[PDB]
Structures are given as C-alpha cells and as structure tokens.
Amino acid sequence: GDLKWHHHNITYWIQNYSEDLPRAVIDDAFARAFALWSAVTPLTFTRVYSRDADIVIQFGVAEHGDGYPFDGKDGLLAHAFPPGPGIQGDAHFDDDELWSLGKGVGYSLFLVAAHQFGHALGLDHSSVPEALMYPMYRFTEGPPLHKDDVNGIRHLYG
C-alpha cells in the first residue's frame, strides 16, 4: 500500500461483530484503541456506517475473503493492511480467538486492535519488547504506548 494516509480525518466501519462480547463493549474497545493513536497524531477517527470507510473492520475465521487465512485458536490473532484504497487500511480479527478484556481468559480486543490500527496507519514492528508494535502479543493493564511507538507514528504524521 502507501506509507501513510494522505488525509487526516480517517473513517472506520465495523462491518460485523463477534458474539464473544456485547456490541457496545466491542465498539468501545475499538474507540479506545483509536483514541490511543489520535491523541498523539493530527489524525481523527470517525465511525461511519458505510462501505466508503477508510478502515473496514471485520471478524472472521480461516479463509475469510482476502487470501490471507487465519489459523484457528491462538497464533495469528488479527491482521491489518497498510494505508491505501480498497482493502488497504482494513483490519480483521480472528474470531477463532476468544475476545475479552484480556485480564482473565482470552485476548484483549483493545490491545490487539491498538496494534492492528498501528499497522493500518503504516507502522511496522518495533524492536522494543515493551512497545505496542512489538511482534509478540502481551497483556498489560498499563499504558500501551512506548516512546518508540510514538516516534514511529510521529515520523509518519508529525
């Protein structure tokens, strides 16, 4: 795709849901993950109910329509495409995971979404183990962003 979005007013569409959590809980988890990135960039994130959205969000299993199949429980948790038109920018979550707040059983939808949205904005992986963009999932209740995450996003967006 591209290295960055060329506009600042990003839109997102939650195309479908997992039944693992109430819709309002899923909506809020995504809103909080977006707010992590909007706080540190000139970007804004606005929810729309439209196929025209920049970031289309889906939950799916196995081969789910893009040629990059999920793998069942664990392993690949989600993936996202770098910015651009069409499928670019979109973020997909493997519903063979149990989505939760992450503290007890399951994976944190908030933390996975925050990492995926980083990719959807153009970030690659960090080499800082504590960073949100490190390649390995990690549960935390503390602040997810490391200096390296902010440095990476500011490098793209100012």
Ligand SMILES: COc1ccc(-c2ccc(Sc3ccccc3[C@H](CCC(=O)O)C(=O)O)cc2)cc1
């Ligand atoms: C607090 O700190 C955190 C740090 C990292 C994470 C975290 C990491 C990884 C994933 S998902 C994943 C898992 C295993 C292999 C590949 C992927 C896809 C790559 C898919 C592909 O390239 O085909 C990817 O890295 O996005 C989600 C969340 C969360 C919190």
Ligand SMILES: [Ca+2]
């Ligand atoms: Ca898109």
Ligand SMILES: [Ca+2]
């Ligand atoms: Ca999986």
Ligand SMILES: [Ca+2]
């Ligand atoms: Ca599930």
Ligand SMILES: [Zn+2]
């Ligand atoms: Zn996909």
Ligand SMILES: [Zn+2]
């Ligand atoms: Zn990643």
